[PDB]
Amino acid sequence: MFRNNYDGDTVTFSPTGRLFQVEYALEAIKQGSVTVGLRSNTHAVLVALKRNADELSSYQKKIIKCDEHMGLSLAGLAPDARVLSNYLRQQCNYSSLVFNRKLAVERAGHLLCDKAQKNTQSYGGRPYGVGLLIIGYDKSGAHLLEFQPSGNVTELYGTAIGARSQGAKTYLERTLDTFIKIDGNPDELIKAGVEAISQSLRDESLTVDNLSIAIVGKDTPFTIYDGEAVAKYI
Amino acid sequence: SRRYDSRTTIFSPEGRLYQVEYALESISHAGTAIGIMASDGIVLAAERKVTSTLLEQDTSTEKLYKLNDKIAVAVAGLTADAEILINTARIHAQNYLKTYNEDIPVEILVRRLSDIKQGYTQHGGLRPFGVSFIYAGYDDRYGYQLYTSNPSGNYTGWKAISVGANTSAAQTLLQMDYKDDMKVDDAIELALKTLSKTTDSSALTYDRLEFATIRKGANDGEVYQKIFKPQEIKDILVKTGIT
Amino acid sequence: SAAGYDRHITIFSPEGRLYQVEYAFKATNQTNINSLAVRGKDCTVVISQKKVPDKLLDPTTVSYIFCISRTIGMVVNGPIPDARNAALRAKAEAAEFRYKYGYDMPCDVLAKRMANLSQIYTQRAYMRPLGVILTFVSVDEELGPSIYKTDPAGYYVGYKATATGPKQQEITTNLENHFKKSKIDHINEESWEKVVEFAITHMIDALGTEFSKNDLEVGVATKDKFFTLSAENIEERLVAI
Amino acid sequence: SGYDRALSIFSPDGHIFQVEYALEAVKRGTCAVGVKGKNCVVLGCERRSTLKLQDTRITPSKVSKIDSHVVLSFSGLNADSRILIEKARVEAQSHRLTLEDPVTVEYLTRYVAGVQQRYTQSGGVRPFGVSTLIAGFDPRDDEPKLYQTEPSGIYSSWSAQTIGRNSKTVREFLEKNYDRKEPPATVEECVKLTVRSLLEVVQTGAKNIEITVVKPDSDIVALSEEINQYVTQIEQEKQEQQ
Amino acid sequence: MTDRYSFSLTTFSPSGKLGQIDYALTAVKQGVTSLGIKATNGVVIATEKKSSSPLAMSETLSKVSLLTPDIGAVYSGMGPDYRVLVDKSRKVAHTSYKRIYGEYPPTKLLVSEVAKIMQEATQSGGVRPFGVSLLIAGHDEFNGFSLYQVDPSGSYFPWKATAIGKGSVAAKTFLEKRWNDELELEDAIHIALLTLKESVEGEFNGDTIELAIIGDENPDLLGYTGIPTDKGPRFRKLTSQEINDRLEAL
Amino acid sequence: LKKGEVSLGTSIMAVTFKDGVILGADSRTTTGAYIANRVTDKLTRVHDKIWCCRSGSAADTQAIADIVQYHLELYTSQYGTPSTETAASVFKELCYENKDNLTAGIIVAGYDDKNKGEVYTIPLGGSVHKLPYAIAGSGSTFIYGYCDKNFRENMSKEETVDFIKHSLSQAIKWDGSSGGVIRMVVLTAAGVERLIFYPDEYEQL
Amino acid sequence: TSIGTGYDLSNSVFSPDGRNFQVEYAVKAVENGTTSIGIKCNDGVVFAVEKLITSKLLVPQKNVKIQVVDRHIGCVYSGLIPDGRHLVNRGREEAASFKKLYKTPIPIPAFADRLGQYVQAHTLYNSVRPFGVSTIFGGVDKNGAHLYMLEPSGSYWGYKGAATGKGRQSAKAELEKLVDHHPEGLSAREAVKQAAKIIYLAHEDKKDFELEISWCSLSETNGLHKFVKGDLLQEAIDFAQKEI
Amino acid sequence: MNIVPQDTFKSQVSTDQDKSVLSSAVPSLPDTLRQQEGGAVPLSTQLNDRHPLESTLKNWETTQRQRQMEQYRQIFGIAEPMKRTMEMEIVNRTDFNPLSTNGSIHRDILLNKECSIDWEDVYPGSTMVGDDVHSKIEKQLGI
Amino acid sequence: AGLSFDNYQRNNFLAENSHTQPKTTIVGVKFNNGVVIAADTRSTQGPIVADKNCAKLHRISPKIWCAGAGTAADTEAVTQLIGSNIELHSLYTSREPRVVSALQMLKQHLFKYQGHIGAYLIVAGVDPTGSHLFSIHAHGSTDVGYYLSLGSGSLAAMAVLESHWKQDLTKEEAIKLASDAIQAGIWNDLGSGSNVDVCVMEIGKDAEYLRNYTP
């Protein structure tokens, strides 16, 4: 009842010291389907469950390639995902064109945090409402980052975001040592990710149409598998 | 009604613009002005809001103004907005003279000012002008012309008209005793009689009036404006039979 | 109270008041600190009460007196954030005056400039007044010792002596009594140490309390420079009398 | 109710109420009618009865000549109509200068609708409270053109349309008396139909009815006595009918 | 989008009155009394120095300001608004007239400029109306001596004698009892002192009264000699000693 | 330079010594062959113990010096006494960023507690060079050898005064744009000292 | 009177008592953050933070709560994480600009003033909101060690010992006791041990937690801000556990 | 830290560079009738034969203010230029007087030009198209 | 806004096509308690004497005076603009104007126009800080001098000043010296002639303007 008085915009604190519009933007993430990311030491994998409007429609694209060494998966608001993916693409292009340099994953996380923090403190706009998972390979190795649209970034070995993502996250946390040592064998890492994302399925089964995979590696450029290309992983 | 009147850019559920209506209603708080077009001239007569004897009557710029040598205006409403609009009209007349080497027709100037007033009702940061104008002019295209403009931006043409505090009674009196073939002297007498009958004070003293005529006969078909001085106003009041 | 839009922005109430300005005036007293200013024969002295109750707070970093320029000093009553904002603005204004007109800015002209800025804040709907009171002191080369005060309402005026704070009425009455006793409108001492001692004793009498070396802050304006006394100088002045 | 205080707000049932309120403002204006004949377009308008002390020499007409071949009529707020008419005339001359060819009726209609739509795209402006009827011929063809424009920026094409106060009655009369397969084959028939339609809602039609006739090759003729003759003929035919 | 405009702060009420202008007038009526009276050979403008502190210097703060060598002004209402208006009026007198015609403006035209600024203050979405009333006295070659009143709405009117502030009505009654067409500048000063006597509730001496006149030229205030056609200033502010001398005598 | 503009045909010296720095110059301004000012003060004060001399366009150098003094007052109000390096950097930025429109060269001499007196030179173009001693102007070209043969580090005050006097006397002797009196400023820990020497003194050296 | 109705829905509004309620609500937001303390030793500063134990999935070396503003300036904060990150970014920009312009590391008071001006500027307009972080920062300059705390109102002070967060009251009590017990001063290692003890004392909220300690000293770290190494950190943790 | 204005020439040109007077018939071309410049003024003619001082005079005040902002940033911090620009933006945005061109009092107070006169003030500096309030309303609102 | 650049291309075109565009001794001397400025009174439009009695001493403020050479219209316009600014600043500060303030205003204004305003000035004055004399160049450079000369007859005047100048001069001695320099310019230069105008500004007194001091 009182929360209804102090939630007009991101410019207003409540008497208890809370910023409600950013909290609602964070709640907007669970409206999206589940995505999983993991990595051992040489490869990074993203697994996505895609959704369609109905039987006659196509499935939503959940994995977007930012550069030949970096990609991301999205869960949440779609316009924000498009805007942030385009921004990251522009930053990678600028780095390559000006310095002949590959953009670092940590640098991309910092840039996304800087761009996201501004919408939480100025009137007229709206906070972003999409969570992102970023996989990449650079001079420091394999990297997986989780981006929260409040303006937060964390570096982790494995995680999951989206609806019902708690089961996949618990499975990943329980079996950390098994998948953290899969070096030089992409197939086992992809299988571990698929099993983890299967832990979060509810009254659903992974088909050849609703499953998407992405992998980046040492000698492996960022590649996306969809359709029959994932049939071997069931 | 109270939910759709804080801004000028919002329609009511009945499609009404309350700020424009309030600006129109504000005119009733001002003194009366009357314009009468005779067959050979135009008469403008306004009633002052003077309430003290310490006011300077000789310095007479409250109701009647000159835009150029051939067009004059009677003002009803806020005088500061009126001065803004009058300076704009003077500049426009001089611009027309500079561009075309001819005197600006009365209707073009009236339409320009009315467009300005309408535009001031269509932006959220502008309030409407709280003024009404009676234009009296002469030009080669139509002869003598009398116009009225209000805060909404609408303008109309008249043979005899009044604006201000007592428009209904003055209009009835003018309707009763207006003839299309009257001379300037008859128009002067009619304007004075209408103001005397409609005045809410005791007697129509000279220091409460402003008078002006636009006539022909200085040297030739050329038209001259005569703005009456307090002595001339008193003389006319004595001559008419009002004193 | 304030009813309507005249509670966020500075517009006229039906009584013809500006409530936001009065509320900024109310904010000016939230620090609960008193300041006094007296001008001598060739110097000006400002004294500000120093309250540092917390034992974890470094006393040396607590100050409400600022050096605006070489000759002008300022004392602020109100919150320290607005105080520092106004201090930086005043420094910039003085330097710009010197650049543009070829001579040093006098105290009264700076006070008028700050008052004009405050007038802007009192008339613009989307700007708020600073909840501070500014007191500039100097020894002007044309007017001698000078004290000027500006408020959130945009009002500025000069003083023979002045005091500001919650207990300003008592100090003002004491000063008026002393001036009626002397009838010279200033202080006849020629050494600024004597004026400092006089101001300290006047503050002690008016507030009815004893001041230690850490409960006061002193600033002195002479012909050539404005400076701030340290703890040792204040202790020496207290020991003298 | 609760969703009607801005032009950028959708109601829960997907309406924008300020547009409907501008339409309500249009509804208060004097009735305007357009009828498309076989080889001409007739615009009729209702004039409020003039006062005794009102000068009729220089009174603006309800029908404005936008260009030599296009005419415009309106219902709603008069001064807004003046602003729109000025913009339309300027645009017609600008098009004639830029492309050497005079505008078509549909082009001018689309431009006017675009201006009206633009004036609904900010919270700091008020939309025009005017609906317009644009009539004419494309300046090489004999096909009549008649369009209607609304405050929201929507325009449509009609064979006969009425806007303003008491427009429903005139629209019913036109629906019961106009045949798209067989439109009036002469100017006289179209003018008579327009006048009879206007007589359904006008007290005294001899002084409250204005008729303008637009024909190919940019002719444009405004009727005077002639309107009174048509009214008397209609009355006499009705008396003979009884 | 929503920052390219701001809604008008002054709007009409259903009765037809602009509320902010009326409230500015109310603030003016709460101000200290000021007055002005025109004679046959001068104009007197007077006001009270209502000091808010005995320790304040009355010489530092002056409510009567020279606009041009022949034009001065006084106010009732809010001081900072008046100070801003005075700066603007001096600047306008130089920009619009002196740099164009080589002359200082007549009284009526400078009054009109100030009134235009005050009117523009009431057609805005960023500022409130000014909360002052101004009395402007002056002299020019083709119009003689003049006195005008300018209101917060931007209206201005010419007066033979008038007052503004707390006791404006009683002062107006007194002046209307005392004004005639054969008055002199000294008689005007005496009448102004009498009128201010009945409004000041405290010390009524040369240190709480501010008076200025528009009279004859003052060659001693020109600052240089050598040009016979160079007329000195007409505006002159009376000192405290002169006010004391006039108060002690009749 | 601009057509009809006033040029600065000066003789400028700045010498670092054991206790600080000394900045000296002549006092002639010319308009070709005509001496428009027999006695001009070419020693410009930018701060209490930061002085400079100027060459190139006179108007441009005056504008730059005024802006730099404004900048140093702004700096002083915040952080206190600026270093000679900071003033040199501000001079260099102003001269370099405007070198396509303004012709300006500066010699900056300063004293501060940390660095104990320094000399910087900013030639035309805007580069900066920190030197034990600097010379500039039309007459300087005639004393490049002599100075190179007579400078020692950590000289006394009197030795530095004599060295500057001799060098500037030769520069005045040979250059037609260099004039009457020699003005010097001594910047040490004690304060600012002004010295002047007349033709009858140095012409007999 | 901690809730002001009618005056707490805009940033730059004064209440009838002259209070700004949005700034106080940002203070409320700060008061619910993680406990962070700073102690000023004889020739340096020590910062200590209590941090919740997260999942093993996070990379251990990429999860640091004590930000390094500059080679000689360290900083911790309590409140909204994105606001603190933005403020640290601005501080790094200011330090870099000052070092580039004046060839020396920025003095701590100048850095504090620039941060305070930036924070205060966000209480002036209704189109922004005040920062929801309180920041404890410190370092070493040519004049010695400095420790400051900065508030959402833009007010900052220099402290002998500062504390913020949920457990601010117990931390302040222990800091006052530490100041009383050591009138002469305190060394760096003693400061590290006492910071560990204070964090452990104030950690009682119930819940596994970790202690992060960093320090910047002239004698120990040569005037550089460094994290406490494994051996010294373990010693501090053991001493704190023995104290409890 | 500029003194004389720099980088004043245009690095590229286009036929739709002036978004205010774009033709409705052909949006990629400008509208010559509503420009009201005389009807025979190609844009290319504005790239040659200019007075060398016109660009310096047009951009002088902006250049001086930019130098002042840079000095504040160097000496005070980011907050000081941020606040100065914010104040100027707020003053400039909330002024819309289509019938007058004179600058506001508050702008001159912020610019420290309360008692300063230049030829811009002395010389503030008819048509059939585009001399109305509505054009200014559209330009101000971006309609 | 400001000075216009319209018809610049048209004027250049007319100049290219054979259309002819249609088209003084001053001294300042300081003495022990003030400053004197003097000038000749001949105004010529080329070789033709337009006016034999021309006032060339102009007043920036009651106690600050100046004289100029170069483009006459530029000199008059700049002097009047700076006088307006000085008067406004004096009203704003409630203080007597300083000569250094006028010097700063003139210098910055002339530097802004990059020498395209052809104003060369001698400015003398007295203010509460003392007496001051300055020379101002068109491009924006200024100088301080105890005695200065300007115009086409400036060399003869400078010779006379160099012959008979001392540190300690009375008012009468300074007036005579300035008049002698102007007379030398009158006799020996074709651009100077007729009468002499003098203005004496003494500390603590009103400025004394003596037109046609020697005819």
mmCIF file with all atom_site columns, N, CA and C in Angstrom, chain A residues 6 10-11 13-15 17 114 117 120-121 123 150 152 155-158 173, chain G residues 8 22 25 29 55-59 62 82-83 85-86 89 127-130:
data_model
loop_
_atom_site.group_PDB
_atom_site.id
_atom_site.type_symbol
_atom_site.label_atom_id
_atom_site.label_alt_id
_atom_site.label_comp_id
_atom_site.label_asym_id
_atom_site.label_entity_id
_atom_site.label_seq_id
_atom_site.pdbx_PDB_ins_code
_atom_site.Cartn_x
_atom_site.Cartn_y
_atom_site.Cartn_z
_atom_site.occupancy
_atom_site.B_iso_or_equiv
_atom_site.pdbx_formal_charge
_atom_site.auth_seq_id
_atom_site.auth_comp_id
_atom_site.auth_asym_id
_atom_site.auth_atom_id
_atom_site.pdbx_PDB_model_num
ATOM 1   N N  . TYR A 1 6   ? 5.679  5.390   -3.548  1.00 0.00 ? 6   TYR A N  1
ATOM 2   C CA . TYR A 1 6   ? 7.076  5.732   -3.787  1.00 0.00 ? 6   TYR A CA 1
ATOM 3   C C  . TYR A 1 6   ? 7.688  4.896   -4.905  1.00 0.00 ? 6   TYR A C  1
ATOM 4   N N  . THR A 1 10  ? 12.595 6.095   -11.157 1.00 0.00 ? 10  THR A N  1
ATOM 5   C CA . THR A 1 10  ? 13.879 5.741   -10.563 1.00 0.00 ? 10  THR A CA 1
ATOM 6   C C  . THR A 1 10  ? 14.506 6.890   -9.791  1.00 0.00 ? 10  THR A C  1
ATOM 7   N N  . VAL A 1 11  ? 13.836 8.044   -9.737  1.00 0.00 ? 11  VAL A N  1
ATOM 8   C CA . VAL A 1 11  ? 14.359 9.211   -9.041  1.00 0.00 ? 11  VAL A CA 1
ATOM 9   C C  . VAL A 1 11  ? 13.913 9.269   -7.587  1.00 0.00 ? 11  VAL A C  1
ATOM 10  N N  . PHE A 1 13  ? 13.370 7.599   -3.752  1.00 0.00 ? 13  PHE A N  1
ATOM 11  C CA . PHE A 1 13  ? 13.579 6.641   -2.678  1.00 0.00 ? 13  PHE A CA 1
ATOM 12  C C  . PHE A 1 13  ? 12.311 6.517   -1.843  1.00 0.00 ? 13  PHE A C  1
ATOM 13  N N  . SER A 1 14  ? 12.103 5.336   -1.280  1.00 0.00 ? 14  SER A N  1
ATOM 14  C CA . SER A 1 14  ? 11.039 5.155   -0.309  1.00 0.00 ? 14  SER A CA 1
ATOM 15  C C  . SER A 1 14  ? 11.534 5.557   1.077   1.00 0.00 ? 14  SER A C  1
ATOM 16  N N  . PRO A 1 15  ? 10.623 5.799   2.025   1.00 0.00 ? 15  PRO A N  1
ATOM 17  C CA . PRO A 1 15  ? 11.069 6.170   3.377   1.00 0.00 ? 15  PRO A CA 1
ATOM 18  C C  . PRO A 1 15  ? 11.951 5.128   4.038   1.00 0.00 ? 15  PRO A C  1
ATOM 19  N N  . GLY A 1 17  ? 14.197 3.446   2.403   1.00 0.00 ? 17  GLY A N  1
ATOM 20  C CA . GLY A 1 17  ? 15.460 3.443   1.695   1.00 0.00 ? 17  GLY A CA 1
ATOM 21  C C  . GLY A 1 17  ? 15.548 2.388   0.615   1.00 0.00 ? 17  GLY A C  1
ATOM 22  N N  . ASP A 1 114 ? 28.684 0.467   -16.850 1.00 0.00 ? 114 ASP A N  1
ATOM 23  C CA . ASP A 1 114 ? 28.647 1.922   -16.946 1.00 0.00 ? 114 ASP A CA 1
ATOM 24  C C  . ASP A 1 114 ? 27.409 2.396   -17.696 1.00 0.00 ? 114 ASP A C  1
ATOM 25  N N  . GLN A 1 117 ? 24.177 1.753   -15.377 1.00 0.00 ? 117 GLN A N  1
ATOM 26  C CA . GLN A 1 117 ? 24.006 2.505   -14.135 1.00 0.00 ? 117 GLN A CA 1
ATOM 27  C C  . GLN A 1 117 ? 23.345 3.858   -14.369 1.00 0.00 ? 117 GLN A C  1
ATOM 28  N N  . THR A 1 120 ? 19.433 4.334   -14.019 1.00 0.00 ? 120 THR A N  1
ATOM 29  C CA . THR A 1 120 ? 18.858 4.142   -12.695 1.00 0.00 ? 120 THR A CA 1
ATOM 30  C C  . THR A 1 120 ? 18.896 5.397   -11.834 1.00 0.00 ? 120 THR A C  1
ATOM 31  N N  . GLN A 1 121 ? 19.394 6.517   -12.359 1.00 0.00 ? 121 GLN A N  1
ATOM 32  C CA . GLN A 1 121 ? 19.558 7.717   -11.555 1.00 0.00 ? 121 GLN A CA 1
ATOM 33  C C  . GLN A 1 121 ? 19.085 8.993   -12.240 1.00 0.00 ? 121 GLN A C  1
ATOM 34  N N  . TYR A 1 123 ? 15.954 11.028  -14.566 1.00 0.00 ? 123 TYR A N  1
ATOM 35  C CA . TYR A 1 123 ? 14.561 11.030  -14.975 1.00 0.00 ? 123 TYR A CA 1
ATOM 36  C C  . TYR A 1 123 ? 14.441 11.013  -16.496 1.00 0.00 ? 123 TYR A C  1
ATOM 37  N N  . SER A 1 150 ? 20.569 -3.919  -13.232 1.00 0.00 ? 150 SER A N  1
ATOM 38  C CA . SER A 1 150 ? 20.776 -2.864  -12.250 1.00 0.00 ? 150 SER A CA 1
ATOM 39  C C  . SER A 1 150 ? 22.131 -2.197  -12.419 1.00 0.00 ? 150 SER A C  1
ATOM 40  N N  . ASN A 1 152 ? 25.193 -4.412  -12.648 1.00 0.00 ? 152 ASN A N  1
ATOM 41  C CA . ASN A 1 152 ? 26.097 -5.287  -11.914 1.00 0.00 ? 152 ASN A CA 1
ATOM 42  C C  . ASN A 1 152 ? 26.654 -6.363  -12.834 1.00 0.00 ? 152 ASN A C  1
ATOM 43  N N  . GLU A 1 155 ? 31.867 -12.414 -12.262 1.00 0.00 ? 155 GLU A N  1
ATOM 44  C CA . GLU A 1 155 ? 32.647 -13.406 -12.988 1.00 0.00 ? 155 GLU A CA 1
ATOM 45  C C  . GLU A 1 155 ? 32.529 -14.743 -12.274 1.00 0.00 ? 155 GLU A C  1
ATOM 46  N N  . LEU A 1 156 ? 32.153 -15.781 -13.016 1.00 0.00 ? 156 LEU A N  1
ATOM 47  C CA . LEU A 1 156 ? 31.841 -17.063 -12.404 1.00 0.00 ? 156 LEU A CA 1
ATOM 48  C C  . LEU A 1 156 ? 32.157 -18.197 -13.368 1.00 0.00 ? 156 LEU A C  1
ATOM 49  N N  . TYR A 1 157 ? 32.331 -19.394 -12.801 1.00 0.00 ? 157 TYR A N  1
ATOM 50  C CA . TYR A 1 157 ? 32.607 -20.571 -13.619 1.00 0.00 ? 157 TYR A CA 1
ATOM 51  C C  . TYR A 1 157 ? 31.356 -21.056 -14.338 1.00 0.00 ? 157 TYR A C  1
ATOM 52  N N  . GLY A 1 158 ? 30.211 -21.020 -13.666 1.00 0.00 ? 158 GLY A N  1
ATOM 53  C CA . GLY A 1 158 ? 28.965 -21.430 -14.281 1.00 0.00 ? 158 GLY A CA 1
ATOM 54  C C  . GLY A 1 158 ? 27.795 -20.764 -13.600 1.00 0.00 ? 158 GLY A C  1
ATOM 55  N N  . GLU A 1 173 ? 26.413 -25.883 -9.317  1.00 0.00 ? 173 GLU A N  1
ATOM 56  C CA . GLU A 1 173 ? 27.191 -25.678 -8.100  1.00 0.00 ? 173 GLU A CA 1
ATOM 57  C C  . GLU A 1 173 ? 27.599 -27.005 -7.474  1.00 0.00 ? 173 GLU A C  1
ATOM 58  N N  . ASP G 2 8   ? 8.555  14.684  0.406   1.00 0.00 ? 8   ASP G N  1
ATOM 59  C CA . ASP G 2 8   ? 9.525  13.623  0.166   1.00 0.00 ? 8   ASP G CA 1
ATOM 60  C C  . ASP G 2 8   ? 9.360  12.975  -1.206  1.00 0.00 ? 8   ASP G C  1
ATOM 61  N N  . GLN G 2 22  ? 14.571 13.238  0.677   1.00 0.00 ? 22  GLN G N  1
ATOM 62  C CA . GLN G 2 22  ? 15.136 12.238  -0.225  1.00 0.00 ? 22  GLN G CA 1
ATOM 63  C C  . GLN G 2 22  ? 16.567 11.883  0.165   1.00 0.00 ? 22  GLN G C  1
ATOM 64  N N  . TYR G 2 25  ? 16.313 9.555   2.993   1.00 0.00 ? 25  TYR G N  1
ATOM 65  C CA . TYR G 2 25  ? 15.943 8.215   2.549   1.00 0.00 ? 25  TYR G CA 1
ATOM 66  C C  . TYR G 2 25  ? 17.137 7.488   1.940   1.00 0.00 ? 25  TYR G C  1
ATOM 67  N N  . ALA G 2 29  ? 18.841 3.971   3.034   1.00 0.00 ? 29  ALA G N  1
ATOM 68  C CA . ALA G 2 29  ? 19.340 2.919   2.151   1.00 0.00 ? 29  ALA G CA 1
ATOM 69  C C  . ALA G 2 29  ? 20.772 2.538   2.502   1.00 0.00 ? 29  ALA G C  1
ATOM 70  N N  . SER G 2 55  ? 28.225 -18.505 -3.666  1.00 0.00 ? 55  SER G N  1
ATOM 71  C CA . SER G 2 55  ? 28.426 -19.851 -4.173  1.00 0.00 ? 55  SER G CA 1
ATOM 72  C C  . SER G 2 55  ? 29.863 -20.038 -4.649  1.00 0.00 ? 55  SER G C  1
ATOM 73  N N  . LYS G 2 56  ? 30.269 -21.304 -4.747  1.00 0.00 ? 56  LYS G N  1
ATOM 74  C CA . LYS G 2 56  ? 31.588 -21.643 -5.264  1.00 0.00 ? 56  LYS G CA 1
ATOM 75  C C  . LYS G 2 56  ? 31.741 -21.307 -6.740  1.00 0.00 ? 56  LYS G C  1
ATOM 76  N N  . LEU G 2 57  ? 30.641 -21.011 -7.435  1.00 0.00 ? 57  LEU G N  1
ATOM 77  C CA . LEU G 2 57  ? 30.703 -20.760 -8.869  1.00 0.00 ? 57  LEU G CA 1
ATOM 78  C C  . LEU G 2 57  ? 31.460 -19.478 -9.196  1.00 0.00 ? 57  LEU G C  1
ATOM 79  N N  . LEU G 2 58  ? 31.511 -18.527 -8.267  1.00 0.00 ? 58  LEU G N  1
ATOM 80  C CA . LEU G 2 58  ? 32.219 -17.278 -8.516  1.00 0.00 ? 58  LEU G CA 1
ATOM 81  C C  . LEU G 2 58  ? 33.727 -17.493 -8.493  1.00 0.00 ? 58  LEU G C  1
ATOM 82  N N  . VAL G 2 59  ? 34.426 -16.790 -9.374  1.00 0.00 ? 59  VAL G N  1
ATOM 83  C CA . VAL G 2 59  ? 35.890 -16.886 -9.433  1.00 0.00 ? 59  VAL G CA 1
ATOM 84  C C  . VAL G 2 59  ? 36.485 -16.217 -8.198  1.00 0.00 ? 59  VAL G C  1
ATOM 85  N N  . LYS G 2 62  ? 38.328 -12.720 -8.648  1.00 0.00 ? 62  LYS G N  1
ATOM 86  C CA . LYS G 2 62  ? 37.598 -11.658 -9.325  1.00 0.00 ? 62  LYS G CA 1
ATOM 87  C C  . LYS G 2 62  ? 36.486 -11.073 -8.467  1.00 0.00 ? 62  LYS G C  1
ATOM 88  N N  . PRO G 2 82  ? 25.689 -0.299  -7.699  1.00 0.00 ? 82  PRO G N  1
ATOM 89  C CA . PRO G 2 82  ? 25.988 0.482   -8.914  1.00 0.00 ? 82  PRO G CA 1
ATOM 90  C C  . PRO G 2 82  ? 26.381 1.921   -8.631  1.00 0.00 ? 82  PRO G C  1
ATOM 91  N N  . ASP G 2 83  ? 25.758 2.552   -7.632  1.00 0.00 ? 83  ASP G N  1
ATOM 92  C CA . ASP G 2 83  ? 26.122 3.919   -7.278  1.00 0.00 ? 83  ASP G CA 1
ATOM 93  C C  . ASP G 2 83  ? 27.552 3.990   -6.764  1.00 0.00 ? 83  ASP G C  1
ATOM 94  N N  . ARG G 2 85  ? 29.970 1.892   -7.509  1.00 0.00 ? 85  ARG G N  1
ATOM 95  C CA . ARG G 2 85  ? 30.846 1.649   -8.650  1.00 0.00 ? 85  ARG G CA 1
ATOM 96  C C  . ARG G 2 85  ? 31.005 2.904   -9.501  1.00 0.00 ? 85  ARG G C  1
ATOM 97  N N  . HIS G 2 86  ? 29.902 3.612   -9.752  1.00 0.00 ? 86  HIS G N  1
ATOM 98  C CA . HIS G 2 86  ? 29.967 4.862   -10.503 1.00 0.00 ? 86  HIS G CA 1
ATOM 99  C C  . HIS G 2 86  ? 30.823 5.899   -9.782  1.00 0.00 ? 86  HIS G C  1
ATOM 100 N N  . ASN G 2 89  ? 34.425 5.054   -10.145 1.00 0.00 ? 89  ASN G N  1
ATOM 101 C CA . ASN G 2 89  ? 34.885 5.417   -11.483 1.00 0.00 ? 89  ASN G CA 1
ATOM 102 C C  . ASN G 2 89  ? 35.191 6.908   -11.575 1.00 0.00 ? 89  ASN G C  1
ATOM 103 N N  . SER G 2 127 ? 15.470 16.254  -11.499 1.00 0.00 ? 127 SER G N  1
ATOM 104 C CA . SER G 2 127 ? 15.655 15.258  -12.545 1.00 0.00 ? 127 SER G CA 1
ATOM 105 C C  . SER G 2 127 ? 16.710 14.215  -12.196 1.00 0.00 ? 127 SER G C  1
ATOM 106 N N  . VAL G 2 128 ? 17.322 14.300  -11.016 1.00 0.00 ? 128 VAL G N  1
ATOM 107 C CA . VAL G 2 128 ? 18.268 13.303  -10.534 1.00 0.00 ? 128 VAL G CA 1
ATOM 108 C C  . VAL G 2 128 ? 17.905 12.961  -9.095  1.00 0.00 ? 128 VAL G C  1
ATOM 109 N N  . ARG G 2 129 ? 18.555 11.928  -8.572  1.00 0.00 ? 129 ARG G N  1
ATOM 110 C CA . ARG G 2 129 ? 18.383 11.531  -7.185  1.00 0.00 ? 129 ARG G CA 1
ATOM 111 C C  . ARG G 2 129 ? 19.742 11.424  -6.513  1.00 0.00 ? 129 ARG G C  1
ATOM 112 N N  . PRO G 2 130 ? 19.804 11.630  -5.200  1.00 0.00 ? 130 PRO G N  1
ATOM 113 C CA . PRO G 2 130 ? 21.085 11.504  -4.498  1.00 0.00 ? 130 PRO G CA 1
ATOM 114 C C  . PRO G 2 130 ? 21.618 10.080  -4.535  1.00 0.00 ? 130 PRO G C  1
#
